[PDB]
Design a binder for this molecule. Structure first.
Ligand code: WAZ
Length: 335
């Protein structure tokens, strides 16, 4: 992967690399000039020549062809795939070029949260875009700030007292949803999920079966991270994740504890947690009830945290759907 990606390289006898936009576990994303389409700047996703990543890239191409046909106008803000090809055995997917990811923008902005009015517009477009996936019998499973990309990330800088530092602000906060390598149809086989992120729905952790509601859980964690600048579940361990949920959201439902086959996490009916160990001391300091994370008692802030609490409902059946989430009072200002 280190060898076929540098700048100046030409792919498929038309795409000329000019910049690197990101490097991850699957491989690379590079910016290219398409010399056979008037010099249109495109984004090309270079996938490692590994079995699991090639199979995911093949499934993502099939999903993208379906979404491009079902939504040719891209009304529902899924990224448009232009074409795909192979290059030295690596699978390459050409995309319409977008801006920075919301994680990238947050990082390059000193990890400062977004203004509430921008969170509102972004949350609405994310819910509409992922509801489009759900209407087409699809589940994304890997929703996170890195996979939410601004259409255009031009900004302005200004100093902010109270923060006592410079703060960037989007000009246009329009976004798109990317990465469909883990996208799963309802009729397809549902796995038990890779290290998906510090966003793992409780039904996913407890192996109770998952579907569309697990996307709603991820969006709720996306919103609080947009509102704070940091995730509320800073961990990669599953039992530690469950202990953070109990501190932030409350106790797990008894029925979910009863059915789960992951006895590894539990001691009888309670979570097998030592709150005086290293991790237990961290969870105590880093975690608190959800509402205590609020930075203002303004009603618009309580409308947002009402939406997050509904999206962070433990039971996947009780959990609000994106169809109902788009009717929430938090989005009344947009109408
Ligand atoms: C390195 O992975 C993290 C992450 C990359 C982002 C942080 C940039 N993953 C990601 N990007 C994708 C697609 C895409 C499409 C258009 C586009 N236009 C400018 S960047 C860009 C990316 C995808 O399928 N996965």
């Amino acid at each position: 992967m280190h060898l076929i990606c540098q700048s100046g390289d030409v792919l498929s006898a038309r795409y000329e690399i000019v910049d690197t936009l990101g490097e991850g576990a699957f491989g690379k994303v590079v910016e290219c000039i398409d010399h056979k389409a008037g010099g249109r700047h495109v984004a090309v996703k270079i996938v490692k020549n590994v079995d699991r990543y090639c199979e995911a890239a093949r499934s993502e191409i099939q999903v993208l062809e379906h979404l491009n046909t079902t939504d040719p106008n891209s009304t529902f803000r899924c990224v448009q795939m232009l074409e795909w090809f192979e290059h030295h055995g690596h699978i390459c997917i050409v995309f319409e070029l977008l801006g920075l990811s919301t994680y990238d923008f947050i990082k390059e902005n000193g990890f400062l949260p977004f203004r509430l009015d921008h969170i509102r517009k972004m949350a609405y477009q994310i819910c509409k875009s992922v509801n489009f996936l759900h209407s087409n019998k699809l589940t994304h499973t890997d929703l996170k700030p890195e996979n939410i990309l601004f259409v255009q990330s031009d900004y302005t800088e200004a100093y902010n007292p109270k923060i006592k530092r410079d703060e960037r602000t989007l000009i246009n906060p329009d976004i798109k949803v990317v990465d469909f390598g883990s996208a799963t149809y309802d009729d397809e086989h549902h796995s038990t999920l890779v290290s998906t992120r510090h966003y793992r729905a409780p039904e996913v952790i407890l192996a109770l079966g998952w579907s569309q509601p697990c996307d709603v859980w991820s969006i709720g964690c996306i919103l609080i991270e947009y509102y704070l600048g940091f995730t509320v579940f800073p961990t990669h361990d599953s039992k530690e994740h469950l202990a953070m949920m109990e501190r932030i959201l409350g106790p797990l439902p008894k029925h979910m504890i009863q059915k789960t086959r992951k006895r590894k996490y539990f001691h009888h009916d309670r979570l097998d947690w030592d709150e005086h160990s290293s991790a237990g001391r961290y969870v105590s300091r880093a975690c608190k009830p959800l509402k205590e994370f609020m930075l203002s008692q303004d009603v618009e802030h309580e409308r947002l945290f009402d939406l997050i609490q509904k999206m962070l409902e433990y039971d996947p059946a009780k959990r609000i759907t994106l169809r109902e989430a788009l009717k929430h009072p938090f989005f009344d200002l947009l109408k």
